[PDB]
């Protein structure tokens, strides 16, 4: 099964021509016209349906009549296709009913996919839009949901109706014929060059310390964590053992007057796949994960834990003091990162969400206790501080 | 003839294979296997098959694969069955009877020659090379001959199936029937032999019809390789005519069949079909529940099959031994620092903490399934729960071992539901059925479980763990239905003490939460205190700052050897083919160890603070040390082997006597009397003892065994070093021990 790969922008670097064949967009940019061209667009992989062998070259044995026919696969709607054509019977008032055998035949892998946006991508607006994909020939099992990976192939309709009615019309459904993958975050380029130009333009670390929430001037040092924590980029898959979370799990306390939330809002906004969130905002089930045996194939579908949103990027959290205790199981479970374990309702499975948690906290009495020593001010079980790096009380 | 599908041709395949079939030999087998040799100087294994099928006229074979490759000259069949198995099976049937024919015209009377060939003859090829489960079922290999495991969900009711047809009497009055040999059904025409209507309407007596039992059983595969985000995948099945109801609901069996795929329709009228076909596996054969219980049958003939199954044990179970690897597993069991090593080689990453490695080893080889006629079900494993300082790996031993056994389930607590923890059952309104679900616990049927935050578990859970721990049944009655769904599993959960760490000013079993039925249950509570030492602090800071220093950081800890690989096989080996006896030695120190860990537990205030020693006690003991004495390959318990056992109980416990809240700030005053009257007493021996020398083992023996239990004896290390400072004795010599002049 052959198949073809983008070009690089070096070809039109050096030879602007229709560009944008090799030019990630997003599904959202796929206008009327565009419509049959080879797209490369990016995002997030979801309900990737398991490998169906699907056939190609349907056969038809007769048994009788011997000739072995060979049907090509339409639509997937098609018929099996009726009494023989074949010679051997034929030419008097007989002939053998054929039959189709699955050896005789041909198949091959077939996946089916969908896509969401980057979050980054949509407008302030409407909803995130999904697409279909049909994953054909080798590349089958390549792919994974939750990888930021650019897919590229065609963008057809194809022709068929549900209720089968007498009115036909175009239910304009699509797919992206899987011609090629690539998954990023397993440069050389302009890129490459401008960081050059940062690395030499000095001071870089109390540069980009200076430059964060370039909005407020003051608190220094909070930013400087939240530097530390935007970077992370560390880690210990020891091998033959103990993974080590290699993030960053920050977290603040104050009062109103230190503008927490605008930091959180400019480094989630900062960091790409950030989000953000509040403590009550979303209850336990909601924050974590939620989980729906799909009935139709009996299959698991997640419906958008923050959390799991929050994979390879940063959870911004507001009033942590008050996210229900009962709740904290879950964040809880988070310091353990990039494992969150389910099983209830018939489903008994783990989904990982590579994440960093920044959250923001209240002393429960109000602005601040002088009588009383820290970590009382704090409410939080030191099993949960334990699982902070940095506790930053203002 | 060449075949126009297979292009296999069939005289060469059957000839090789009747004198194969004769050639046959355990030996072949044990070469390939390398194992030890007798089997009665290899008899012919095949005939003895074939006569003791014959006898009991059972018609169907069992039969490994491995076997068939393992003689020269097949290989061409043992593959050709993996690629051809719908004709292989055609020839294999074929030449079965037809060596049947020729033994019964060598051997005088069975079945007159006539019966035997009337009646048909299948064959079951088990075990033809275990493949890589769901995720790896190619389309390519849709005609092959794939293995499965995985417990199965859900039995389709015995479905019949037609096979030949009776078609109704006429007014002709001669009633026709006939086979059908395809999906199609013809009636003909005209009625019956005389055309006394040849214009006719006949019909069929859907009663006295053949027919032939078609079962659907759903499955779920083992989660051995399932990475994340999907929950395991499911294939369904069909069972033919003599392996129905050979699996009921949640059995683990393991399948051996042939992939299929077939179309669908959607909207059914019309005769367009669908293409993306389905799939299911049409089996051949089923090795019964990979499991021992053997209570009651469940089917037909196919027990003969489990008996002729079960026998072969030692290879088929290992699925792989060697007297190169059995003579490392023995030169293992001989190394002394054994249980000490094989500890730190469960978990090389985890630091000093020990104990806690040890108390897992010994849930990983947990005791033997001791099965009485009388009573029945003793909980044949263990249960560990762990507890102790935030931040004290706990959870990172958890991920640890869910990594090492091949069967675990991780999960967490309070982001999971009593159904989460046992499966739930669901009367299938489609065929009005039994069906059970996801059980966590029972898909850790057989291996440990792992469970977090048991603690922030709900008391509305935590309930079922009251019953399947100390049971290994769950006993499930809703509107639909009652029943009970046995999940024998090693449950292995850890905690955290209220609030954020211990209160040294509060009692024990007050500072873990769990009330004192369920904490009992618990056969083995873990206390893992973190130190303010500074002493192992910086050790332990090397420790992790090492496995900084390299890029891909190995073996973090000593650099000593140790089999990370090799001590998965070493354990299912141990579990399988050892079985632990408590000689009777043992039984009197097991007595007495548990008589005073209860009169020590015994006070007037020690009922509402303390933890009670009660008879689980004595079942952790027990069930422990046939553990422990399965580890070092050991075939019999001896009475040094519950000493430790008894050691790890009083982990948890060894300091209070009447009020808890341990303490324990670790020479006393007591400890300098012990001394001083010890170098009284061995003064006064070896001034009367004239022959001055003896070693420092005589004098043991001389004294520490008069009466009651033996000293540390390095204690008396240290009072003879005393007496060497005060010089009131000399050693001289390792050997012998004098004293001055
Ligand atoms: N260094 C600063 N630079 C600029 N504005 C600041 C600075 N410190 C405080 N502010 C202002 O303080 C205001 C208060 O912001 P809020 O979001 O209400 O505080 P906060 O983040 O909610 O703190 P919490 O979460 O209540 S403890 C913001 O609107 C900022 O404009
Ligand atoms: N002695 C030790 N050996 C190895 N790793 C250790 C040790 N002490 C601490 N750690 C590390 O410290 C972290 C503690 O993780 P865990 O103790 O498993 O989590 P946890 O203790 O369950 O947290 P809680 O509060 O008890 S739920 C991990 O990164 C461990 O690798």
Same mark, same amino acid.
């Given at each position: ?394 | ?30 070469? $390939? +296997? !390398?194992? /030890? ?7 012919? =294994? ?6 003791? *099928? &014959? #006898? ?56 007159? $020659? +006539? !019966?035997? /060939? ?7 090829? =088990? ?6 489960? *769901? &995720? #790896? ?57 005389? +055309?006394?209507? /040849? ?543």
């Amino acid at each position: 099964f052959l198949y073809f790969k983008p070009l690089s922008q070096n070809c039109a670097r050096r030879y602007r021509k229709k560009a944008i064949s090799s030019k990630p967009l997003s599904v959202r940019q796929i206008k009327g016209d565009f419509l049959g061209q080879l797209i490369t667009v990016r995002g997030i992989i979801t309900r990737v349906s398991d490998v169906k062998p699907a056939v190609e070259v349907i056969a038809y044995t007769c048994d009788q009549c011997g000739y072995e026919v060979f049907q090509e696969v339409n639509s997937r709607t098609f018929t099996p296709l009726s009494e023989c054509t074949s010679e051997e019977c034929s030419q008097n008032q007989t002939k053998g009913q054929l039959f189709m055998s699955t050896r005789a035949s041909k198949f091959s892998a077939f996946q089916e996919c969908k896509i969401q946006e980057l979050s980054q991508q949509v407008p302030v607006g409407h909803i995130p839009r999904s697409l279909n994909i049909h994953v054909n020939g080798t590349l089958v099992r390549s792919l994974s949901p939750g990888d930021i990976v650019d897919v590229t192939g065609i963008f057809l309709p194809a022709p068929y109706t549900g209720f089968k009615a007498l009115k036909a019309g175009l239910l304009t459904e699509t797919y992206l014929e899987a011609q090629f993958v690539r998954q990023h975050k397993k440069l050389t380029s302009d890129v490459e060059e401008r960081v050059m130009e940062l690395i030499t333009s000095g001071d870089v670390y109390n540069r980009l310390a200076k430059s964060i929430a370039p909005e407020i001037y003051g608190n220094l040092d909070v930013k400087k964590a939240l530097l530390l924590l935007l970077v992370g980029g560390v880690d210990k898959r020891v091998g033959d053992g103990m993974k080590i979370r290699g993030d960053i799990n920050v977290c603040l306390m104050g009062d109103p007057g230190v503008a927490k939330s605008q930091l959180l809002k400019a480094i989630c906004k900062i960091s790409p796949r950030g989000v953000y969130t509040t403590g009550k905002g979303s209850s336990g089930v909601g924050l974590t994960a939620a989980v729906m045996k799909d009935p139709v194939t009996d299959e698991m579908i997640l419906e958008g834990g923050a959390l799991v949103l929050a994979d390879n990027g940063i959870c911004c959290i507001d009033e942590f003091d008050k996210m229900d205790e009962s709740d904290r199981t879950a964040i809880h479970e988070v310091m353990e990162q990039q494992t969150i374990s389910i099983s209830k309702a018939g489903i008994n499975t783990t989904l990982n969400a590579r994440t960093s948690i920044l959250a923001a906290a209240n002393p429960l009495y109000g602005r601040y206790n002088p009588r009383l020593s820290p970590l009382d001010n704090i409410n939080l079980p030191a099993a949960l501080l334990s699982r902070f790096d940095i506790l930053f009380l203002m | 003839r060449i075949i126009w599908g297979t292009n296999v041709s069939i005289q060469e395949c059957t000839t090789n294979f009747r004198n194969f079939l004769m050639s046959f030999k355990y030996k072949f087998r044990k070469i $390939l +296997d !390398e194992r /030890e040799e007798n089997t009665t100087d290899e008899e012919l =294994y095949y005939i003895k098959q074939l006569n003791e *099928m &014959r #006898e009991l006229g059972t018609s169907n074979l069992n039969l490994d694969a491995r076997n068939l490759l393992a003689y020269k000259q097949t290989e061409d069949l043992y593959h050709q069955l993996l690629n051809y198995p719908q004709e292989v099976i055609s020839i294999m049937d074929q030449t079965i009877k037809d060596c049947m024919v020729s033994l019964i015209v060598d051997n005088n009377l069975d079945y007159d $020659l +006539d !019966e035997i /060939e009337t009646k048909f003859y299948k064959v079951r090829p =088990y075990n033809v090379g275990s493949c890589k489960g *769901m &995720r #790896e079922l190619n389309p390519n290999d849709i005609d092959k001959l794939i293995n499965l495991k995985g417990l199965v969900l859900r039995s389709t009711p015995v479905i019949p199936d037609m096979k030949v047809a009776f078609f109704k009497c006429n007014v002709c009055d001669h009633t026709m029937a006939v086979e059908i040999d395809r999906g199609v059904i013809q009636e003909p025409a005209r009625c019956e032999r005389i +055309d006394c209507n /040849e214009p006719n309407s006949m019909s069929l007596i859907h009663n006295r019809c053949s027919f032939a039992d078609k079962q659907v059983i759903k499955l779920q595969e083992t989660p051995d390789f399932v990475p994340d985000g999907q929950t395991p995948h499911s294939i369904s099945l069909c069972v033919y005519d003599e392996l129905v109801d050979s699996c009921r609901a949640g059995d683990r069996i393991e399948v051996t069949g042939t992939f299929r795929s077939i179309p669908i329709r959607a909207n059914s009228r019309q005769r367009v079909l669908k293409s993306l076909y389905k799939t299911y596996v049409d089996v051949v054969h089923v090795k019964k529940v990979s499991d021992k219980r053997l209570d009651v049958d469940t089917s037909t003939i196919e027990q003969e099959l489990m008996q002729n199954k079960v026998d072969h044990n030692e290879v088929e179970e290992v699925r792989q031994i060697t007297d190169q690897d059995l003579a490392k597993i023995r030169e293992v069991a001989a190394r002394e620092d054994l249980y000490s090593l094989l500890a730190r080689s469960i978990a090389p990453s985890i630091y000093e903490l020990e104990d806690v490695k040890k108390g897992i080893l010994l849930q990983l080889f947990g005791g033997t399934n001791k099965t009485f006629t009388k009573g029945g079900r003793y909980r044949g494993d263990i249960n560990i729960l762990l507890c102790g300082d935030p931040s004290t790996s706990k959870s990172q031993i958890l991920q640890y071992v869910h990594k090492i056994t091949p069967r675990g389930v991780y999960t967490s607590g309070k982001g999971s539901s009593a159904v989460g923890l046992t499966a739930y059952i669901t009367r299938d309104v489609d065929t009005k059925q039994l069906v059970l679900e996801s059980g966590a616990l029972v898909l850790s049927d057989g291996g440990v479980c792992c469970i977090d935050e048991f603690d922030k578990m709900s008391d509305s859970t935590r309930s079922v763990l009251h019953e399947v721990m100390e049971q290994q049944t769950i006993s499930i009655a809703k509107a639909g239905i009652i029943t009970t769904l046995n999940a024998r599993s090693s449950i292995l959960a850890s905690a955290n003490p209220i609030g954020s760490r211990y209160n040294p000013n509060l009692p024990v079993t007050e500072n873990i939460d769990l009330p004192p039925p369920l904490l009992s249950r618990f056969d083995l509570v873990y206390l893992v205190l973190d130190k303010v030492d500074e002493k192992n602090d910086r050790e332990l800071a090397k420790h992790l700052t090492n496995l900084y220093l390299e890029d891909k950081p190995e073996h973090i800890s000593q650099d000593d050897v140790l089999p990370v690989e090799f001590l998965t096989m070493y354990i299912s080996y141990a579990k399988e083919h050892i079985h632990p006896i408590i000689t009777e030695a043992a039984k009197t120190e097991l007595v007495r160890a548990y008589v005073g860990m209860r009169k020590m537990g015994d006070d007037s205030r020690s009922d509402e603070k303390r933890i009670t020693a009660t008879t689980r006690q004595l079942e952790s003991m027990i069930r422990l040390a046939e553990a422990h004495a399965k580890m070092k390959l050991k075939n019999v318990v001896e009475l040094e082997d519950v000493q430790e056992a008894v050691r790890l109980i009083r982990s948890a416990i060894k300091d209070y006597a009447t009020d808890p809240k341990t303490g324990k700030i670790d020479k006393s005053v007591i400890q300098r009397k012990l001394q001083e009257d010890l170098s009284r007493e061995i003064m006064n021996v070896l001034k009367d003892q004239a022959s001055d020398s003896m070693s420092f083992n005589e004098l043991i023996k001389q004294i520490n065994e008069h009466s009651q239990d033996r000293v540390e004896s390095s204690d008396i290390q240290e009072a003879l070093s005393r007496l060497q400072q005060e010089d009131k004795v000399i050693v001289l010599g390792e050997g012998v021990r004098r004293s001055v002049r």
